[PDB]
Amino acid sequence: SAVSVLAPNGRRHTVKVTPSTVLLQVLEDTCRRQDFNPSEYDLKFQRTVLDLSLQWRFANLPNNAKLEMVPVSRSR
Structure with missing residues (x-):
């Protein structure tokens, strides 16, 4: 398993x-x-939100598990 974070700030x-x-x-x-x-950054992949209370065993992420980086405070 692998996770990827793509920063919209131009940082991949x-x-x-x-x-x-x-x-x-x-x-x-x-x-x-x-x-x-986290309160200033949020992660979301496709239709799945990526945060702290998001375990792979649950959130079930893809192989390279590519997540999107977004500034904010947790999901909401």
Whole structure:
């Protein structure tokens, strides 16, 4: 399994995550290294929202699991 994050700011980065790994840990990890906040950033893929409370084991993401990056505070 692999996850991809396409930043609309012109920044395209892909992060390989596990299908059993919580996006929270990945998002938090990438957010930590990428010094980013969820309350200021939101992730969504197709018809599935990508956030912290969105586990792959549930949100069921695609192989490269490509997610779209969007500035904001969680889904809503």
